[PDB]
Copies of this chain bind each other. A is one copy, B any other.
Amino acid sequence: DGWVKVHPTPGTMLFREILHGQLGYTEGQGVYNVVRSSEATTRQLQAAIFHALLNATTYRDLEADWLGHVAARGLQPQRLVRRYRNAREADIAGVAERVFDTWRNTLRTTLLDFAHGLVACFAPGGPSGPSSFPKYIDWLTCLGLVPILRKRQEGGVTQGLRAFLKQHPLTRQLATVAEAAERAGPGFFELALAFDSTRVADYDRVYIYYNHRRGDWLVRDPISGQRGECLVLWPPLWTGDRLVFDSPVQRLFPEIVACHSLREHAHVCRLRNTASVKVLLGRKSDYDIIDVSKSMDDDTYVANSFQHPYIPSYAQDLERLSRLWEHELVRCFKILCHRNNQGQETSISYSSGAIAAFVAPYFESVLRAPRVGAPITGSDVILGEEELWDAVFKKTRLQTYLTDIAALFVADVQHA
């Protein structure tokens, strides 16, 4: 009653089998490997965790901890000045500055270690299993749809968070860490639940139905009978006894099939030329291959015979198709390429627009995660863990608090 079949149709299977090179392969198609990588989402997770943890810091407890360290060394301004007993302000100021710098560096190292401890919990979940990103990307590449399944339940990631958090020594050892961690904890739990609940259907189990008369989707997993939900990102076009998607594979499809057919014909012609001598027989009027045509003739004579061993040439088409694949993917997925003075393709990366367009819908719709803050710039995908942590640290609240406390402490020591 107005329903049609979309996904389990043979053409849909042929699209993915094209994605594995089941007819032809080219240098251009190899670029797709970069598009599927999970690097951007892991960078985004790291950035979000760093923001959440570092933003929770506070001034009062940090000042209390610094003053407590000074008390532990017993090096407050009065005692130090009374001990040194000289008017060389530069030396005393430098001593205080170096003490504070040592404390600053150790605090930074502690916070970095804890933040890395948090990150490890989520990283394995993202690329494989529930919410696997590469499956999402190849779903988009093949069809533009992305079936999804949802159930609320505690699972691996929540257990990992619970195991890691509840007994971490840093929480006991520092009040700053204790407060920041207890504040950011609930958000981490909700993000873990978000990673836990959702799954992206498998390309070889799910069923998808479409009813043109309304324009709504029914998606089901036959094995468990579990109804799902469909996310459409590039909507299709219905033209009667048809459904035409607008995915990159659909645009490229009519070309690669023609190229493959040309290659197969050229292969068939080559086998024909194996025999070097060919002989043609005829009927009387009343490494070698024989063409016996005498059985067709009757009251008929042979008048002419032509030979022309044609062999189609197809390298030009393969070159054209390789460059077509490369340009299509690069422009469709907003990839950015880096190059040397003349040397090409030093590296391949995700542009800022690419991450905004693809990673953002992933987190927001597919996972329904609570918050990710401001997205990272396209340049930060190239950085490492240390560089990203340093970048997040440098331009946020904790640095300003530390600098203010340092300036105040130096002024107080030299004024006391």
In the assembled complex, 16 residue pairs joining A and B whose CB atoms fall closer than 8 Å, in A order, are A17-B244, A20-B237, A25-B254, A26-B324, A30-B331, A34-B331, A39-B356, A102-B404, A123-B360, A124-B365, A203-B237, A277-B278, A277-B291, A280-B303, A290-B296, A308-B309
| Chain A stretch 282-299: residues in CB contact (< 8 A) with chain B | 282-285, 287-288, 290-294, 296-297, 299
| Chain A stretch 240-278: residues in CB contact (< 8 A) with chain B | 244, 246, 250-252, 254-255, 258, 262, 265, 267-274, 276-278
Q: Are A276 and B309 in contact (CB under 8 A)?
A: yes
The smallest beta-carbon distance between A373 and chain B, in angstroms, is 7
Known contacts A39-B353, A281-B297, A284-B301; decide if A239 and B204 are in contact (CB<8 Å): yes
| Chain A stretch 20-62: residues in CB contact (< 8 A) with chain B | 20-27, 30-31, 33-34, 37-39, 42
Q: Are A204 and B238 in contact (CB under 8 A)?
A: yes
Q: Are B296 and A20 in contact (CB under 8 A)?
A: no
How many copies of this chain does the complex contain? 2
| Chain A stretch 318-364: residues in CB contact (< 8 A) with chain B | 318, 320, 323-324, 327-328, 331-332, 334, 336, 339-344, 347-348, 351-353, 356-357, 360-361, 364
The smallest beta-carbon distance between A164 and chain B, in angstroms, is 11
A374 close to chain B: CB less than 8 A:
yes
Task: Identify 17 new A-B residue pairs, CB closer than 8 A, beyond the known A281-B303, A284-B301, A290-B296.
Answer: A23-B254, A34-B331, A37-B357, A84-B415, A98-B407, A102-B401, A105-B397, A106-B400, A124-B365, A135-B235, A203-B237, A272-B287, A273-B308, A280-B302, A281-B297, A283-B301, A336-B347
A71 close to chain B: CB less than 8 A:
no
Q: Are B384 and A352 in contact (CB under 8 A)?
A: yes
Q: Are A343 and B339 in contact (CB under 8 A)?
A: yes
Q: Are B20 and A244 in contact (CB under 8 A)?
A: yes
Chain B residues lying within 8 Å of A272, measured Cβ to Cβ, are 276, 287
The smallest beta-carbon distance between A161 and chain B, in angstroms, is 16
Chain B residues lying within 8 Å of A300, measured Cβ to Cβ, are 281-284, 294
Q: Are A386 and B404 in contact (CB under 8 A)?
A: no
